[PDB]
Write a protein that binds this ligand. Structure first.
Ligand SMILES: Nc1ncnc2c1ncn2[C@@H]1O[C@H](COP(=O)(O)OP(=O)(O)O)[C@@H](O)[C@H]1O
Ligand SMILES: [Cl-]
Length: 379
């Protein structure tokens, strides 16, 4: 009766299980090894994951995402007040706690962040159970190192709502280190840097590990820098391209923009493996198809400042930890955006040619470690 490890991500979640002496990252029903942290409400259905993200352009007011930004926070939290301004869904105040408010089956309903995240966790649980062939009841769930007691509590509550006994809540960078077996070291402090550039957030963590004991020495980053911002640079580029070619501005058609955004994310992923990608959108605007392409070099240029901006938080973290570059024993890549070759070059160059740990898909490393830790806690 295996326990599972779940990365409850800002933009994508991932689930793994340790059995038969190895971790298996589990693909969902569509074959995807990570699942959007999306929940949608319609006149007839509640959709979660791929199904929810796949109709986000159609249903912006009732498709919820970014619940991780709300979870465990008070309504009057400056972070909440700030983030609310840029979401298409309504956030309301219930006793100084935020709720997301939507239309569902024709009625106005509101949900706590931990309710939305419970739905994502249920999906991840079900993905695992489909693979294992039996019900899962124990899990380790991960959170950012900077999460406070309230954020951790709300995340655990999300797990319990999903029918999971939460064995432990552990930090995302700790989980990534565990994935690479860095917890197995003996007596003697090792310094580990986790470079996590995900879908919506950028987190640099410096850990010391000593005889299997973890300590957080420094954290740095940007909570609004991630893969979606690279998607956005491509969107703006292609909006201009469409304008020049067709003399039409699509920028205020929310559907067109959202659909373009989706196609840009796809092309971006392809550019991590190939030096060019083709974008082909049928009926992008007024029935006009948009078939074009983008090179890796052009993509890099469009994002050059954003990519470069990831290094100063590394510098800052090193300063705070009172360590020189040469004193870092291991460099660990986390988050889907670290699969971008230019990002890898920047970090490697900054560390004067050091190896990067990147053999585990970086968007799966957190779940991988959580799965290992879950197995350890089960015995
Ligand atoms: N091969 C790839 N190349 C570039 N970006 C990728 C790749 N795979 C996933 N991504 C991006 O990674 C981001 C999601 O990162 P992930 O680690 O899965 O989740 P999160 O940061 O939400 O925990 C998205 O912006 C997605 O487009
Ligand atoms: Cl705990």
């Amino acid at each position: 009766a295996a326990a599972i490890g779940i990365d409850l991500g800002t933009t994508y979640s991932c689930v793994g299980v340790f059995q038969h002496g190895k971790v298996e990252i589990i693909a969902n029903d569509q074959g995807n090894r990570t699942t959007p942290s999306y929940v949608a409400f319609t006149d007839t259905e509640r959709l979660i994951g791929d199904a929810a993200k796949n109709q986000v352009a159609l249903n912006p007011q009732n498709t919820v995402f970014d619940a991780k930004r709300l979870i465990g926070r008070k309504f009057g939290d400056p972070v909440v007040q700030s983030d609310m301004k840029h979401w298409p869904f309504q956030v309301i105040n219930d006793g100084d706690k935020p709720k997301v408010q939507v239309s569902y089956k024709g009625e106005t309903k509101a949900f706590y962040p931990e309710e939305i995240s419970s739905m994502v966790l249920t999906k991840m649980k079900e993905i695992a159970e489909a693979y294992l062939g039996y019900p899962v009841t124990n899990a380790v769930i991960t959170v950012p190192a900077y999460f406070n007691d309230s954020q951790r509590q709300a995340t655990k509550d999300a797990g319990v709502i999903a029918g999971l006994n939460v064995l432990r809540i552990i930090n995302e960078p700790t989980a990534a280190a565990i994935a690479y077996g860095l917890d197995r070291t003996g007596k003697g402090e090792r310094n580990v840097l986790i470079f996590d550039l995900g879908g919506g957030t950028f987190d640099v963590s410096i850990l010391t590990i000593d005889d299997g004991i973890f300590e957080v020495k420094a954290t740095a980053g940007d909570t609004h820098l991630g893969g979606e911002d690279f998607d956005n640079r491509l969107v703006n580029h292609f909006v201009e391209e469409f304008k020049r070619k067709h003399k039409k501005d699509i920028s205020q058609n929310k559907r067109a923009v959202r659909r373009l955004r989706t196609a840009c994310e796809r092309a971006k992923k392809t550019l991590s493996s190939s030096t060019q990608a083709s974008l082909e959108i049928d009926s992008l605007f007024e029935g006009i198809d948009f078939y074009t392409s983008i090179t890796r070099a052009r993509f890099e240029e469009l994002c050059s400042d954003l990519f470069r901006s990831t290094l100063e938080p590394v510098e800052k973290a090193l300063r705070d930890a009172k360590l020189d570059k040469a004193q870092i024993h291991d460099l660990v890549l986390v988050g889907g955006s670290t699969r971008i070759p230019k990002v890898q070059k920047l970090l490697q160059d900054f560390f004067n040619g050091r190896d990067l740990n990147k053999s585990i898909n970086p968007d799966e490393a957190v779940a991988y470690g959580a799965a290992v830790q879950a197995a350890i806690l089960m015995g």
